[PDB]
């Protein structure tokens, strides 16, 4: 009696992209460009490094998977002007460093004179944008 299991990934949120993580903030402008890019070996999304490596798992959605180079960043919710009465907790800042192009309607990653920082900009500043914040996840209650 040969009998295998076959539960294949078969719906939309079934591509859990390995996305790099950095240390807890504050940091410098080095450790977003210092983290190497992810080169997925595409039949099974094989992601490997030999140095001191650190990443995180997300379920993978239409904005994460569409991002060319996403890198998560541990932070807290104090950085963003939230109006909900929910408590300040840990926030894993999914930074897409690919789309560095400025928009007046989205949040960006602008290294404040050598300190990586998350602020809104109604006009394009002189300070260069290091990446774009696509997602800001929060843990289960």
Q: Which residues bind its own copies (CB under 8 A)?
A: 1-11, 13-18, 21, 42-63, 65-66, 72, 74, 77, 80-84, 90-92, 104-107, 120, 133-141
What is the DSSP secondary structure assignment for residue 78, as one 8-state letter?
A: G
Cα radius of gyration rounded to whole Å, the chain: 17
Cα 77 off chain centre by: 15
Residue 78 in contact with other proteins, rule: CB under 8 A: no
Q: Map residue 121 onto helix, strand or coil.
A: coil
Residue 43 in contact with other proteins, rule: CB under 8 A: no
Distance separating alpha carbons of residues 107 and 109, to the nearest angstrom: 7
Question: H or E segment at 31?
Answer: helix 30-33
Residue 5 in contact with other proteins, rule: CB under 8 A: yes
Q: Which does 113 bind (CB under 5 to 8 A by kind): its own copies, other proteins, none?
A: none
- Which residues make up the interface to other proteins (CB under 8 A)? 2-12, 14, 61-64, 83-86, 94, 105-106, 134-135, 137-138, 140-141
């Amino acid at each position: 009696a040969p009998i295998p299991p076959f539960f294949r990934f078969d719906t939309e949120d079934e591509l859990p992209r390995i996305v790099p993580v950095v240390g807890q903030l504050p940091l410098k402008a080095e450790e977003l460009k210092a983290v190497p890019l992810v080169e997925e070996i595409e039949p099974f999304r094989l992601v490997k490094f030999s140095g001191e490596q650190a990443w995180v798992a997300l379920p993978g959605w239409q904005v994460l998977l569409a991002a060319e180079d996403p890198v998560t960043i541990l932070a807290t919710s104090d950085r963003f002007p939230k109006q909900n009465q929910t408590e300040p907790g840990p926030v894993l800042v999914v930074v897409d460093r690919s789309q560095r192009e400025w928009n007046d309607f989205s949040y960006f990653v602008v290294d404040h004179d050598g300190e990586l920082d998350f602020q809104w900009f109604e006009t394009k500043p002189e300070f260069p944008i290091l990446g774009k914040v696509i997602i800001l996840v929060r843990p289960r209650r």
